[PDB]
């Protein structure tokens with residue numbers, strides 16, 4: 001079995017990762033056939049973090065690109081497509097400075113074109129792209145696009161699909177198949193995959209990624225309290241105000257000190273109140289909304305919640321040792337976590353402590369996002385799983401992106417399968 005390869009660089013807001021995928025040459029159009037071969041994490045920040053030094057964006061990719069030359073057999077380099085796709089970090093930089101954004105894309109382009117792979121371009125994905133391609137990855141890997149049954153006895157209704165919730169560093173996406181009528185063309189997606197029509201809803205909330213939410217809570221805590229009720233008692237840090245208010249996500253909060261001391265107080269109730277200010281539920285120009293006046297039909301079906309949903313839930317279960325099987329359990333785990341002092345929290349984590357002071361805020365954010373924002377309840381929440389991998393492949397938008405650009409999912413089966421699915 002001759003294999004083929006393809007490569008995607010996911011240039012996210014906080015990190016770039018490289019995925020190399022492989023599949024058999026003569027089975028390439030079967031669903032679920034493509035899988036991850038290897039991956040590489042680029043050291044340092046995302047490409048948008050090089051906005052004032054765009055040369056370093058391209059250079060940052062070199063070590064992982066050297067790994068790709070070793071991971072893919074040499075005689076296949078020339079015919080292996082290589083893509084770079086960038087997400088909300090670059091969408092935010094594009095708001096601030098389209099020129100700096102262009103210089104970063106130019107610097108990564110120049111680096112990538114020096115390599116022997118068939119480089120097909122560096123692009124910023126839309127929020128819709130990001131949501132939909134994540135949904136295609138999960139469902140492709142789990143073989144949900146197979147028509148189950150056999151002639152004369154097809155399963156009905158057809159096999160359900162897995163909704164996707166992705167909590168990145170600078171935006172978050174929700175995407176799922178729905179039977180409700182569309183009310184906003186911005187959210188409406190129609191896919192034709194293996195001869196079947198999928199009616200999908202998607203939305204991306206810019207500035208609702210983990211790192212931007214933490215920045216917004218920090219801005220809010222500085223304004224309202226001059227302490228940080230989500231941070232643990234005994235933790236303090238010197239906050240440089242310029243970093244807090246430079247983001248498009250926080251410049252709306254700006255209130256002439258350069259640096260302020262800010263300490264935690266382990267106040268789970270005040271933390272909950274701080275997080276609640278993130279969601280505007282005051283108006284809805286549609287029949288129903290999620291939040292911020294965005295149309296959303298009722299959630300339905302199973303969901304996979306990956307990226308920082310998985311990392312936060314993994315902290316709560318594995319480090320705090322708390323169950324999160326229900327929304328009530330998640331809320332209780334968040335309360336217990338938020339009420340820990342800094343010495344108590346550190347006692348649970350013998351190794352490196354990065355992100356530890358932030359789990360209370362992120363867990364509170366996720367609980368409110370699911371319950372207040374998307375309107376999960378106990379019944380719908382029972383159908384959510386927290387997982388970051390399927391069939392030995394990382395779940396994210398990268399695979400679905402590669403599948404689309406490489407044209408590896410047919411709209412129709414060959415010969416329409418003689419019309420046996422009609």
Ligand SMILES: Nc1ncnc2c1ncn2[C@@H]1O[C@H](COP(=O)(O)OP(=O)(O)NP(=O)(O)O)[C@@H](O)[C@H]1O
Nearest residue numbers: 012013014015087088168169170171210307308311
């Ligand atoms: N191994 C890990 N453990 C705990 N947290 C992590 C880990 N890796 C990443 N994170 C955090 O989780 C958040 C989302 O990470 P990731 O999904 O890599 O976002 P991204 O692709 O960089 N951002 P975006 O461009 O908005 O999709 C970031 O705030 C990360 O710092």
Ligand SMILES: [Zn+2]
Nearest residue numbers: 012087168169
């Ligand atoms: Zn991402």
